[PDB]
């Protein structure tokens, strides 16, 4: 339509039309808005659009059009500025400066066009980065001068200076070369006396103007870097800590300034500077107490009400108090006249710690950890904070969040359900709360116990009964395990368990009993020491866990199984032995009762139960009894297995039954589960099922293939095939699990490996892509990892079966077959480490695909793949180097050296693989250092492309000069030459080499980068 006219540059720019396009974009909607967007984007990206900028700034009626004109200039200034001749640069400088000035002097524009003015100031700062001070030495003096004649211009110059400080000190590390950041920092530093003088005058001569706020905002940035004498040897501290704290206009920014002041680099030896550090805190706390709120104020309620800026203010107060006190509280701890100030400041933090706001609570909790850790180790300090610590115990006990183990939760309807998702944030918060509360318990174990016991009493009588309150208490009780004496722990733990069991019987309905059960289970699972010494309780605990396995809430059942695991991995010894007063080892009675204990458990909970029994059985070290205990445990799965093995080999038609595959799946999951906890001790049970299991694997494989043939690829999605594949995956999981923990490696090679490979490898190779299980590759990785060195032919065979076919699945795009991708490079990683000989036996065309596969991995943004790709390249180069001066290594370097060098350079420089920078750099360093140390014995150049005598060093430089010249044609030969000179000299010094690479990445995004930047180191 009409709007596309602005893209035709042969005509003059219709400014009114531009403004319609802009207001259509910003103020419009739907198809018209999106149409305007595409046009505006194309206009902005037109490489001559900057020539229209002056015209837009003069003639447009739309502030957003002028914003966009500056964006266009910004892009030119930061990227192509140094191609422009002097006249254009000076010209653009002049109308940016002139526009800022004229916008500031029209008082209505200064009020109404803040966005446009700030954008002009930023654009000016981009010009300063290119031009100042080398080609604009007068800027700071002229800025200082022009501030005196207009308060709007003065205020706006504080913004310019703020932005300048930010760009030079806060955001230079990524965006400028090391040399240029150093040059601009030095330049700002030399001119700062004059900048501070102007800043200080403005603060003395004014109360709470918009000028004062802008000046203080500028000071906040200066405090990141300025020498401390500007803060301590002037009156600025007194002004910040008194005058600018009273006025609410200046308060927020002042408080941030004072927070940064609390982190300035200061003398430790000087008694006067210490007094000034104390004084500004004294002043600030005074202003807060008298102007904002007293120490007793309910900040929880204030924050909840959310009037004006109260939330941001309380956040900033928290940051100020914690920052200051973590660094300087020792200054307040000895002098008795400073005690009230110390304790009021901490009392403020106590009040802030009651606020209902997770992120703020984490902020204060970090400080409390810092405090209580110090009080735990520093002599004669804890008595000062006794009343603070006592209040803190209450706060933490009443605000405990749910630990990882507690599987029952309270939803929005008000019902108790099993948790849908793990809450990793709240798990971490629980742990941070535990650390603090553990320290607090050591600091006064009597106080902590009394608080907890009386809170429990008010859950018994029902005067404070709630789900929230029984939960927080029980979680707190569990969290402090290990803090009390064995005797104190005995009486405490028995008291709370007895009292919680009393609650579990009293309360009505299935919701309340799920809550109390989860709390009982959390507590007992946290106190294994107590349960070890008191078998009476341990046994009752366990049969109570077995009682919870029959409840209708699945969360209660799940938690019983996990608590059983948790108790068992600490108390296993007390099950393995026949104790006094007992007919038998408790293990053996558990085993025979399994049928009925686990009757109402669902399969996954049953498998956890069996894994727990596996943990117990593995405590028994006499080989005979363990092998038997294993036999006893596995009888129900082995009998199901023995009756299902005979039916499926008497007729392969019964395995069609979907109910039968489910039983088979669960039999193997039970074996996996037990093998997980028993490891090398599982061998007898594995050897019982191994040959028949691998025949079943083949039987299941045939039917999957037949179903795909008859039904098509869509068969892989069906419940039946997914069930059959589950059997294959679980079989693979069992063999992988065993071999990972195996302690008879001769038995693995001689018994397990050959049948495994015959059963799985050709089945994988000869299935269609969608039928191949990634778990095959995972399984082989462990095989190669543990026994690769003992089976060189077996590893060759693994490669032949999986390498070319898996590569073909994963080399069309970066997305398809994600788990194959990941397991593939894990496999090649381990083969390249442990059995590199296998790659030496690949034919030359297949070895070429190995190199292609490695470089393909570099280009992934998937970090599972990327990291393994770069590691393989690095290990490969190292493997080749170890062979020495032999034909394979000489051939490798001629065929592939420059392929690795240029592929590494490509990912380093394309801006789409920044996450692997460190590994890319290390790899590039290794490759360059091979030539620099003459470890390549042959010429890398082809015969008669350079003179005969010339070294690989000289040729490497010319190759790379040429490569970079063509890939980055906007670089001068000089930039390229200096970069490569620096890079080659720094190839033993990783951190410097990386700095030089980073400098190069800055220089390729602009024109006219200084070649001497590469002499920085």
């Amino acid at each position: 339509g009409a709007m596309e006219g602005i893209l035709d540059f042969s005509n003059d720019l219709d400014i009114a039309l531009l403004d319609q396009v802009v207001s259509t974009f910003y103020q419009g909607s739907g198809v018209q808005q999106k149409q305007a967007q595409e046009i505006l984007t194309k206009f902005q990206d037109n490489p001559d659009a900057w020539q229209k900028a002056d015209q837009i700034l003069q003639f447009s009626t739309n502030p957003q059009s002028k914003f966009i004109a500056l964006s266009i200039l910004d892009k030119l200034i930061t990227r192509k500025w140094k191609l422009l001749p002097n006249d254009h640069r000076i010209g653009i400088r002049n109308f940016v400066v002139g526009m800022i000035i004229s916008m500031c002097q029209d008082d209505e524009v200064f009020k109404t066009q803040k966005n446009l003015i700030n954008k002009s100031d930023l654009t000016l700062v981009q010009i300063l980065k290119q031009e100042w001070p080398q080609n604009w030495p007068e800027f700071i003096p002229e800025l200082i001068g022009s501030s005196s004649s207009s308060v709007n211009v003065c205020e706006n110059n504080m913004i310019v200076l703020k932005l300048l400080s930010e760009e030079v000190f806060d955001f230079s590390a990524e965006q400028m070369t090391q040399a240029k950041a150093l040059h601009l920092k030095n330049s700002m530093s030399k001119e700062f006396e004059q900048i501070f003088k102007l800043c200080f005058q403005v603060l003395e001569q004014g109360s709470s103007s918009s000028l004062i706020v802008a000046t203080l905002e500028s000071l906040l940035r200066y405090l990141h870097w300025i020498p401390y004498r500007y803060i301590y040897e002037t009156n600025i501290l007194e002004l910040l800590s008194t005058k600018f704290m009273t006025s609410p206009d200046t308060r927020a920014i002042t408080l941030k300034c004072l927070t940064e002041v609390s982190n300035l680099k200061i003398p430790q030896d000087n008694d006067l500077i210490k007094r000034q550090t104390v004084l500004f805190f004294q002043n600030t706390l005074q202003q807060i107490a008298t102007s904002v709120m007293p120490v007793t104020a309910d900040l929880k309620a204030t924050y909840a009400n959310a009037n004006g800026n109260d939330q941001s203010f309380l956040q900033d107060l928290a940051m100020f108090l914690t920052t200051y006190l973590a660094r300087n509280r020792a200054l307040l701890e000895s002098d008795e006249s400073l005690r009230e100030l110390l304790l009021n400041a901490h009392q403020y933090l106590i009040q802030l710690s009651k606020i209902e706001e997770r992120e703020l609570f984490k902020t204060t909790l970090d400080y409390w950890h810092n405090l209580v850790a110090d009080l735990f180790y520093e002599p004669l300090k804890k008595h000062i904070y006794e009343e603070i610590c006592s209040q803190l115990r209450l706060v933490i006990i009443e605000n405990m969040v749910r630990p990882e183990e507690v599987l029952v939760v309270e939803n929005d309807e008000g019902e108790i359900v099993r948790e849908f998702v793990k809450e990793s944030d709240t798990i971490q918060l629980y742990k941070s709360e535990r650390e603090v509360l553990v320290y607090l318990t050591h600091l006064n174990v009597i106080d902590t116990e009394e608080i907890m016991i009386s809170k429990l009493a008010r859950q018994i009588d029902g005067s404070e009964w709630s789900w929230h309150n029984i939960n927080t208490l029980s979680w707190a009780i569990g969290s402090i395990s290990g803090t009390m004496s064995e005797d104190t722990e005995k009486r405490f733990v028995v008291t709370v368990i007895k009292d919680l069991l009393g609650l579990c019987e009293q309360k009505r309905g299935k919701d309340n009993k799920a809550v109390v059960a989860s709390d009982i289970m959390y507590v007992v699972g946290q106190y294994p020491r107590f349960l070890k010494a008191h078998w009476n309780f341990l046994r009752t605990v366990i049969l109570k866990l077995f009682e919870f396995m029959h409840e209708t809430h699945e969360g209660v059942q799940d938690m019983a199984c996990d608590t059983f695991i948790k108790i068992v991995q600490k108390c296993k010894y007390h099950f393995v032995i026949q104790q006094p007063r007992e007919s038998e080892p408790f293990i053996q009675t558990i085993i025979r009762d399994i049928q009925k204990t686990t009757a109402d458990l669902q399969p996954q909970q049953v498998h956890t139960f069996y894994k727990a029994c596996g943990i117990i059985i593995s405590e028994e070290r006499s080989v005979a009894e363990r092998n038997r205990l294993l036999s006893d445990l596995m009888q129900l799965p082995n009998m199901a297995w023995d009756t299902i093995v005979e039916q499926s080999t008497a007729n392969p038609t019964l395995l069609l039954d979907s109910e039968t595959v489910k039983i088979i799946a669960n039999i193997i999951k039970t074996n996996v589960a037990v093998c997980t906890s028993m490891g090398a001790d599982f061998y007898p049970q594995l050897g019982h099922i191994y040959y028949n299991m691998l025949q079943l694997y083949r039987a299941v494989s045939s039917m999957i293939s037949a179903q795909v043939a008859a039904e098509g690829l869509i068969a892989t999605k069906t419940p039946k095939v997914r069930g059959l594949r589950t059997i294959k995956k679980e079989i693979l999981k069992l063999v992988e699990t065993y071999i990972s923990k195996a302690r008879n490696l001769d038995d693995v090679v001689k018994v397990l490996v050959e049948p495994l490979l015959n059963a799985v490898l050709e089945d994988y190779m000869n299935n269609v892509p969608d039928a191949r299980d990634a778990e095959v590759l995972n399984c082989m990785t462990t095989v190669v990892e543990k026994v690769g060195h003992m089976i060189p032919q077996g590893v060759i065979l693994i490669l032949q079966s999986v390498f070319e076919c898996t590569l073909d699945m994963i080399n069309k795009d970066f997305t398809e077959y994600p788990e194959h991708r990941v397991e593939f490079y894990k496999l090649l990683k381990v083969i390249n480490e442990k059995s590199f000989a296998a790659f030496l036996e690949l034919p030359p065309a297949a070895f070429k695909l190995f190199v292609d596969a490695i470089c393909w991995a570099f280009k992934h943004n998937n970090r599972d793949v990327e990291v393994n790709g770069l590691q393989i390249a690095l290990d490969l180069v190292k493997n080749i180097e170890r062979m020495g001066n032999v034909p394979f290594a000489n051939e490798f370097h001629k065929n592939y050296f420059f392929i690795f060098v240029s592929e590494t350079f490509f990912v380093l420089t394309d801006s789409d693989h920044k996450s692997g920078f460190s590994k890319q750099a290390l790899l590039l360093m290794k490759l360059i250092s091979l030539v620099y140390d003459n470890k390549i014995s042959v010429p890398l150049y082809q015969e008669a492309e350079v003179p005969q005598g010339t070294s690989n060093q000289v040729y490497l430089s010319q190759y790379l000069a040429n490569m970079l010249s063509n890939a980055f044609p906007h670089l001068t030969s000089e930039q390229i030459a200096s970069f490569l000179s620096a890079l080659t000299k720094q190839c033993k010094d990783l951190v410097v080499f990386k700095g030089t690479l980073r400098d190069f990445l800055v220089q390729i995004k602009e024109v006219g980068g200084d070649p001497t930047d590469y002499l920085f180191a």
Binding site: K114, N118, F171, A306, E359, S424, Q428, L429, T815, R863
Partner: protein
């Protein structure tokens, strides 16, 4: 019905478009189709203080597809900064997005979101995430995939924008549905589509729901 401009920024691939699409249609987009410049989408929520409309300016995170960049931020009344807890680079870029954003929008409520917390191998851990503290941003762990805390950013912003901390989402009213008779003049295509739908497998058959 009052409306508010919301800008959504962050590195490429962090889940900004996925997060918005989840809220618009309920879907979970699995593919990565990089946003070009910006896509604007209306999004209404019903609350106990009436409907609130967000005009969601979902911006591009890839530099090469950035379009107008900070040009999109003009007159935004709130923002979400997105990163990916499986990618440390995306967290290290948060101060850069924040910088560009607040230079244009000096006093707006802003939520920082760490997306992809469903993934087990988490690289940016809870205790590393502190940039929000000094900048007065609200922070949430989120997942567009599992929907963990997916409503929190909008709920927090709605409370800040309306100036009511007890604001809650409420059940939108349910009008009685019609009894439209089926017309054989588009039955053939409607049952063509049904049999195709039956033979296309549902995604993520291993999920709990």
């Amino acid at each position: 019905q009052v409306q508010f401009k919301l800008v959504l920024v962050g590195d490429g691939g962090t889940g900004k478009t996925t997060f918005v699409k989840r809220h618009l249609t309920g879907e979970f987009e699995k593919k990565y189709v990089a946003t070009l410049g910006v896509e604007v989408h209306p999004l209404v929520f019903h609350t106990n203080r009436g409907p609130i409309k967000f005009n969601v300016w979902d911006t591009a995170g890839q530099e090469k597809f950035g379009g107008l960049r900070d040009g999109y931020y003009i007159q935004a009344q709130c923002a979400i900064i997105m990163f990916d807890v499986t990618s440390r680079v995306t967290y290290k870029n948060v101060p850069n997005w924040h910088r560009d954003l607040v230079r244009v929008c000096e006093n707006i409520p802003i939520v920082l979101c760490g997306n992809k917390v469903d993934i087990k191998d988490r690289k940016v851990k809870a205790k590393s995430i502190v940039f929000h503290r000094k900048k007065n941003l609200q922070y949430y762990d989120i997942s567009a995939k599992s929907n963990y805390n997916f409503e929190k950013p909008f709920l927090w912003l709605a409370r800040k924008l309306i100036g009511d901390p007890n604001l809650e989402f409420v059940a939108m009213p349910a009008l009685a549905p019609p009894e439209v008779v089926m017309d054989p003049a588009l039955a053939a295509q409607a049952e063509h589509d049904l049999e195709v739908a039956q033979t296309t497998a549902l995604p993520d058959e291993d999920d709990d729901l």
